[PDB]
């Protein structure tokens, strides 16, 4: 539940598919799977999360956008 682990695990998944410098639906999906499968139960579907996370329009859910989830994962 550490922060350093978030980066590590994150990259561990971001490196899974495509460049680890960018997250994806399938990529994040996995994370959201193990990382927080409960967040998947939310009313925010994968696609919803994907589009939700990306509020810039790059397609990459970099850790930056991820920090946005940490908020929901906090509440
Ligand atoms: La982005």
Swiss-Prot record:
<dbReference type="InterPro" id="IPR018247">
    <property type="entry name" value="EF_Hand_1_Ca_BS"/>
</dbReference>
<feature type="binding site">
    <location>
        <position position="22"/>
    </location>
    <ligand>
        <name>Ca(2+) 1</name>
    </ligand>
</feature>
<feature type="modified residue" description="Phosphoserine">
    <location>
        <position position="38"/>
    </location>
</feature>
<dbReference type="InterPro" id="IPR013787">
    <property type="entry name" value="S100_Ca-bd_sub"/>
</dbReference>
<dbReference type="InterPro" id="IPR001751">
    <property type="entry name" value="S100/CaBP7/8-like_CS"/>
</dbReference>
<dbReference type="GO" id="GO:0016324">
    <property type="term" value="C:apical plasma membrane"/>
</dbReference>
<protein>
    <recommendedName>
        <fullName>Protein S100-G</fullName>
    </recommendedName>
</protein>
<dbReference type="GO" id="GO:0005499">
    <property type="term" value="F:vitamin D binding"/>
</dbReference>
<feature type="binding site">
    <location>
        <position position="54"/>
    </location>
    <ligand>
        <name>Ca(2+) 2</name>
    </ligand>
</feature>
<keyword id="KW-0106">Calcium</keyword>
<dbReference type="GO" id="GO:0016323">
    <property type="term" value="C:basolateral plasma membrane"/>
</dbReference>
<feature type="binding site">
    <location>
        <position position="56"/>
    </location>
    <ligand>
        <name>Ca(2+) 2</name>
    </ligand>
</feature>
<keyword id="KW-0007">Acetylation</keyword>
<dbReference type="GO" id="GO:0005737">
    <property type="term" value="C:cytoplasm"/>
</dbReference>
<dbReference type="InterPro" id="IPR002048">
    <property type="entry name" value="EF_hand_dom"/>
</dbReference>
<feature type="binding site">
    <location>
        <position position="65"/>
    </location>
    <ligand>
        <name>Ca(2+) 2</name>
    </ligand>
</feature>
<dbReference type="Pfam" id="PF00036">
    <property type="entry name" value="EF-hand_1"/>
</dbReference>
<keyword id="KW-0677">Repeat</keyword>
<feature type="domain" description="EF-hand 2">
    <location>
        <begin position="41"/>
        <end position="75"/>
    </location>
</feature>
<feature type="binding site">
    <location>
        <position position="58"/>
    </location>
    <ligand>
        <name>Ca(2+) 2</name>
    </ligand>
</feature>
<keyword id="KW-0848">Vitamin D</keyword>
<keyword id="KW-0597">Phosphoprotein</keyword>
<dbReference type="GO" id="GO:0005509">
    <property type="term" value="F:calcium ion binding"/>
</dbReference>
<dbReference type="Pfam" id="PF01023">
    <property type="entry name" value="S_100"/>
</dbReference>
<feature type="domain" description="EF-hand 1">
    <location>
        <begin position="9"/>
        <end position="44"/>
    </location>
</feature>
<feature type="binding site">
    <location>
        <position position="60"/>
    </location>
    <ligand>
        <name>Ca(2+) 2</name>
    </ligand>
</feature>
<dbReference type="GO" id="GO:0048306">
    <property type="term" value="F:calcium-dependent protein binding"/>
</dbReference>
<keyword id="KW-0479">Metal-binding</keyword>
<dbReference type="InterPro" id="IPR011992">
    <property type="entry name" value="EF-hand-dom_pair"/>
</dbReference>
<feature type="binding site">
    <location>
        <position position="27"/>
    </location>
    <ligand>
        <name>Ca(2+) 1</name>
    </ligand>
</feature>
């Amino acid at each position: 539940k550490s922060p350093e682990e978030l980066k590590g695990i994150f990259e561990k998944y971001a490196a899974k598919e495509g460049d680890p410098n960018q997250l994806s639906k399938e990529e994040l999906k996995l994370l959201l799977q193990t990382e927080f499968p409960s967040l998947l139960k939310g009313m925010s579907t994968l696609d919803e999360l994907f589009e939700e996370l990306d509020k810039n329009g790059d397609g990459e859910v970099s850790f930056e956008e991820f920090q946005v989830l940490v908020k929901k994962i906090s509440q």
